[PDB]
Amino acid sequence: ASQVRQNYHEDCEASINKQINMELYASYVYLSMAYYFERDDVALPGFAKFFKESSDEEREHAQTFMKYQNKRGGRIVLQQIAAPSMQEWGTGLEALQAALDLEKQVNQSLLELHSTASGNNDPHLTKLLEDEYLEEQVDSIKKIGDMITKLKRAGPRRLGEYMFDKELN
Amino acid sequence: ASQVRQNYHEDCEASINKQINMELYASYVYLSMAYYFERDDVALPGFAKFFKESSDEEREHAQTFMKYQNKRGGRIVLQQIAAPSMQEWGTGLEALQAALDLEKQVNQSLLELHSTASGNNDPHLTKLLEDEYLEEQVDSIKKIGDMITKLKRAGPRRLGEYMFDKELN
Amino acid sequence: ASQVRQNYHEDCEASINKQINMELYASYVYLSMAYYFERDDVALPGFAKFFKESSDEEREHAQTFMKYQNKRGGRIVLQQIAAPSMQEWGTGLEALQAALDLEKQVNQSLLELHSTASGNNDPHLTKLLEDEYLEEQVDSIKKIGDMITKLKRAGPRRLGEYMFDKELN
Amino acid sequence: ASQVRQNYHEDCEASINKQINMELYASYVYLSMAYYFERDDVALPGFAKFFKESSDEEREHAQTFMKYQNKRGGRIVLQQIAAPSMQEWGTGLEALQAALDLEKQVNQSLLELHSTASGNNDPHLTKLLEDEYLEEQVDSIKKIGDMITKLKRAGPRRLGEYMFDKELN
Ligand SMILES: [Cl-]
Ligand SMILES: [Cl-]
Ligand SMILES: [Cl-]
Ligand SMILES: [Cl-]
Ligand SMILES: [Cl-]
Ligand SMILES: [Cl-]
Ligand SMILES: [Cl-]
Ligand SMILES: [Cl-]
Ligand SMILES: [Cl-]
Ligand SMILES: [Cl-]
Ligand SMILES: [Cl-]
Ligand SMILES: [Cl-]
Ligand SMILES: [Cl-]
Ligand SMILES: [Cl-]
Ligand SMILES: [Cl-]
Ligand SMILES: [Cl-]
Ligand SMILES: [Cl-]
Ligand SMILES: [Cl-]
Ligand SMILES: [Cl-]
Ligand SMILES: [Cl-]
Ligand SMILES: [Cl-]
Ligand SMILES: [Cl-]
Ligand SMILES: [Cl-]
Ligand SMILES: [Cl-]
Ligand SMILES: [Cl-]
Ligand SMILES: [Cl-]
Ligand SMILES: [Cl-]
Ligand SMILES: [Cl-]
Ligand SMILES: [Cl-]
Ligand SMILES: [Cl-]
Ligand SMILES: [Cl-]
Ligand SMILES: [Cl-]
Ligand SMILES: [Cl-]
Ligand SMILES: [Cl-]
Ligand SMILES: [Cl-]
Ligand SMILES: [Cl-]
Ligand SMILES: [Cl-]
Ligand SMILES: [Cl-]
Ligand SMILES: [Cl-]
Ligand SMILES: [Cl-]
Ligand SMILES: [Fe+3]
Ligand SMILES: [Fe+3]
Ligand SMILES: [Fe+3]
Ligand SMILES: [Fe+3]
Incomplete structure (x- = not known):
């Protein structure tokens, strides 16, 4: 094993490589959405x-897991990053709804990793997840939920969408 | 009696303890409303x-009355603070209407205390009420009335409510 | 359920509403003590x-729990806040002893909530409790214990109480 | 009458000349106390x-009444200022007790003047009394009461008096 490895279970190591791929995928989905909203026929800069x-x-999150893998003496294994589920994301509300669902899928995966780490008695990894992942995930879900409610109030299309987009810019 | 007490009637002392409870209650109602508007399915930050x-x-007002009780040599008696009348406050307009009614109830209680103080020939207490309570109460009622009119013009729901909420933030 | 809710058990939601009431009650007890010590016949400004x-x-703690309830998609339910146990709090030492006991009661309730959260496999909530509540609670208990010892050395009445009060001011 | 006089009753004018004498007397009492506490065998600089x-x-208060008399078109009539009741004022506590009693006598006289002004329907004079006299009088009485309590806790003689004196310096 690595000269640094201590109390680091192979199942946790493998699951971290999974989280890295998942968050690179989420980063790619959001990149797709970002440029979709800059199409000349969409034009929602916020x-x-x-x-x-x-x-x-999301890319930074993946990189933090890569750094963590090395810190514990595990070995990063990178896999293909799937194409985003869509090429076109519809309305602003539809993109936010897709983002909410994606954030909750990532949250579920992180909670499963926390359960794996807890079951393997790895408190360094449970602390990482609590402090560097689970908190930001809940905050992101609440923010997107708020955004969905605000956009449904404002619009969610036409002038209200135009005005809401300005609040994000 | 307290070594400081002079020209301070027991009925005024008791009514001040009532005003303290009333304004702590009003503070609690407004706290409930504040967090109601931060629910993910409400999301009205203004x-x-x-x-x-x-x-x-309202809490500061209650504290000013507590300080006043001690200044005159009366004795603060704190009672239970009732639960807010509602747990959910409806639309922005409905919350403002509830606030207007609450402010006018507090104003009526303060005017009754002023009448009690005047009838007991307590000019220190009538001055306190005029300068530290009755003025701010009238200004609050006018502000909320203005807000209600503006929100009814803008909305009072949908895009107009979204836009009005930004004026308060 | 709320669009944000994920891995949030109803028993944790209900217990958070309990913690909110408890900490509003503790805030009210301490407010009572604060103004008791400003009576002209007590006059202990520290x-x-x-x-x-x-x-x-304590009010800020309650507000952090209200914000947390909304963040997770739970629903704040506010109850009556009981009158403080006493209207008059005795000597400085007696008030500190009452405060120590109250802080340890709040700590016990928070530890019970941590056990509930742990049993329901809610690491976001266990982290909140550890970082935002249990640490400050232990620090407060140690501070009050220190204060009790210092006041017993100085006094705990007469000149020693007068001098100790200056250390708090 | 004076070219400025309007709604200014002779009884109010005469009572103001009384208040001026009373507050010059109080000023003289406090001057006596001040230098008593600088005797080499007393030596309480606080x-x-x-x-x-x-x-x-107190002298400034008297001067404000002199200015007020002229503002309303009344005529200042100055009388002899009695010698202070004592030449030696005893302990620090005894001087504070004498001061409390004097402040409450002045307060009673000011409240009687307020009643005279109110009965003569002089709202300019009731406002003067409320804003420039009755408030400061109540604050002074509360301060002296607090001081008495603190000094009784600290001492009121020997080391506690020595230490309390430092809080006033
Ligand atoms: Cl290796
Ligand atoms: Cl290992
Ligand atoms: Cl292993
Ligand atoms: Cl292991
Ligand atoms: Cl597509
Ligand atoms: Cl849509
Ligand atoms: Cl896992
Ligand atoms: Cl919609
Ligand atoms: Cl559109
Ligand atoms: Cl349409
Ligand atoms: Cl009393
Ligand atoms: Cl009285
Ligand atoms: Cl009475
Ligand atoms: Cl009376
Ligand atoms: Cl309700
Ligand atoms: Cl409405
Ligand atoms: Cl009343
Ligand atoms: Cl309407
Ligand atoms: Cl709406
Ligand atoms: Cl509609
Ligand atoms: Cl709900
Ligand atoms: Cl859930
Ligand atoms: Cl549940
Ligand atoms: Cl659950
Ligand atoms: Cl009691
Ligand atoms: Cl004691
Ligand atoms: Cl619990
Ligand atoms: Cl003791
Ligand atoms: Cl004592
Ligand atoms: Cl003793
Ligand atoms: Cl003349
Ligand atoms: Cl006249
Ligand atoms: Cl006349
Ligand atoms: Cl007249
Ligand atoms: Cl003498
Ligand atoms: Cl003495
Ligand atoms: Cl008079
Ligand atoms: Cl004594
Ligand atoms: Cl002495
Ligand atoms: Cl002695
Ligand atoms: Fe992530
Ligand atoms: Fe108020
Ligand atoms: Fe607390
Ligand atoms: Fe005076």
């Missing part, structure tokens, strides 16, 4: 900026 | 901020 | 300031 | 400073 920042944040 | 500031102001 | 800050901190 | 400031404040 939504575009929101999704570009979300894309960057 | 209304939330308006009610959080109103909650703080 | 104790008054200590309890006014404690009152503010 | 008490001395407290009474010198009190003396100045």
Whole structure:
């Protein structure tokens, strides 16, 4: 084993490689959305900026897991990143709904990893998940939920969507 | 009696303890409204901020009466604070209407205390009420009335409510 | 359910509404103590300031739980806030002893909530409790214990109480 | 009558000349106390400073009434200022007790003047009394009451008096 490895179970190592792929995929989905909202026939720059920042944040999350794998003496194994589920994302509301569902899927995967880490008595990994992943995930879900409610109030199409988009820019 | 007490009638002392409870109750109502407007399915941050500031102001009013009781040599007697009348406050307009009615109930109680103080020839207490309570109460009632009119013009629901909420934030 | 709710058990939601009431009650107790120490026949401004800050901190704790309830998609339910157990709090030492006992009761309730959250496999809630509640609670208990010892050394009445009160101001 | 006089009753004018004498007398009492506390066999510089400031404040109050008399078109009539009741004022506590009683006598006289002004329907004079006299009088009485309680806790003689005197300096 690595000279640094201690109390680090192979199942946790493998699941971290899964989380890395998942968050690179989420980053790719959000990148797709970001540029979809910059099409000349869409032109929602607030939504575009929101999704570009979300894309960057998911990539940073994946990188934090890569750094963590090395810190514990595990070995990063990178897999193909699937194409985004869609090429076109519909209305602003539909993109936010897709984002909410994706964030809740990532949250479920992170909670499953926390359960794996807890079952293997790895408190360093449970702490990482609590502090660096689960908190930001809940905050993101609440933010997107709020956004959905606000956009449904404002619009969710036509002038209300135009005005809501300005709040994100 | 207290070594400081002078020209301070027991009925005024008791009524001040009533005003303290009333304004703590009003503070609690506004706290409830503040967090109602931060629910993910409500998401009106301007209304939330308006009610959080109103909650703080009512608590400060109660504290000023507690300080006043001690200044005159009366004795603070604290009672249970009732649960807010509602757990959910409806639309922004409905919450403002509830706030207007509550402010006018508090104003009526303060005017009754002023009449009690005047009838007991307590000019220190009539001055307190005029300067520290009755003025702010009338200003609050006018502000809320204005807000109701503006929100009815803008909306009072859908895009107009979304836009009005931004004026409060 | 709320569009944001995920891995949030009804028993945790209900217990959070309990913690909110408990900490609003504790805030009210400390507010009572604060103004008791500003009576003209008590006149302990250091104790008054200590309890006014404690009152503010407990209210902030309650508000953090209200925000948390909304973040997770639970629903805030506010109940009556009981009158403080006493209207007059005795000596400075007696008030500190009452505060120590109250802080340990709140700590026990928070530890019970942590056990509920752990049993329901809610690591977001266990992290909240550890970071935002249990640490400050232990620090408050140690501070009050220290204060009790110092006041017993200095006094706990007469000149020693007068001098100790200056250390808190 | 004076070219400025309007709605100014002779009884109010005469009572103001009384208040002027009373507050010059109170100023003289406090001046006596101030220098009593600077005797080499007393040597309480905090008490001395407290009474010198009190003396100045009472003289300023008298001067505000002199200015007021002229503002309304009344005529200042100055009388002899009696010698202070004592030449030696005893302990710090005894001087504070004498000050409390004097402040409450002045307060009673001011409240009687307010009743005279109210009965003569002079709202300019009732406002003067409320804003420039009755408020400061109640605050002074509460401060002295607090001081008495603190000094009784600390001492009121020997080391506690020595230490309390430092809080006033
Ligand atoms: Cl290796
Ligand atoms: Cl290992
Ligand atoms: Cl292993
Ligand atoms: Cl292991
Ligand atoms: Cl597509
Ligand atoms: Cl839509
Ligand atoms: Cl897993
Ligand atoms: Cl919709
Ligand atoms: Cl559209
Ligand atoms: Cl349409
Ligand atoms: Cl009493
Ligand atoms: Cl009285
Ligand atoms: Cl009475
Ligand atoms: Cl009376
Ligand atoms: Cl309800
Ligand atoms: Cl409505
Ligand atoms: Cl009344
Ligand atoms: Cl309407
Ligand atoms: Cl709406
Ligand atoms: Cl409609
Ligand atoms: Cl709900
Ligand atoms: Cl759930
Ligand atoms: Cl459940
Ligand atoms: Cl659950
Ligand atoms: Cl009691
Ligand atoms: Cl004691
Ligand atoms: Cl529990
Ligand atoms: Cl003891
Ligand atoms: Cl004592
Ligand atoms: Cl003793
Ligand atoms: Cl003349
Ligand atoms: Cl006249
Ligand atoms: Cl006349
Ligand atoms: Cl007249
Ligand atoms: Cl003498
Ligand atoms: Cl004495
Ligand atoms: Cl008179
Ligand atoms: Cl004594
Ligand atoms: Cl002595
Ligand atoms: Cl002795
Ligand atoms: Fe992520
Ligand atoms: Fe109020
Ligand atoms: Fe707490
Ligand atoms: Fe005066």
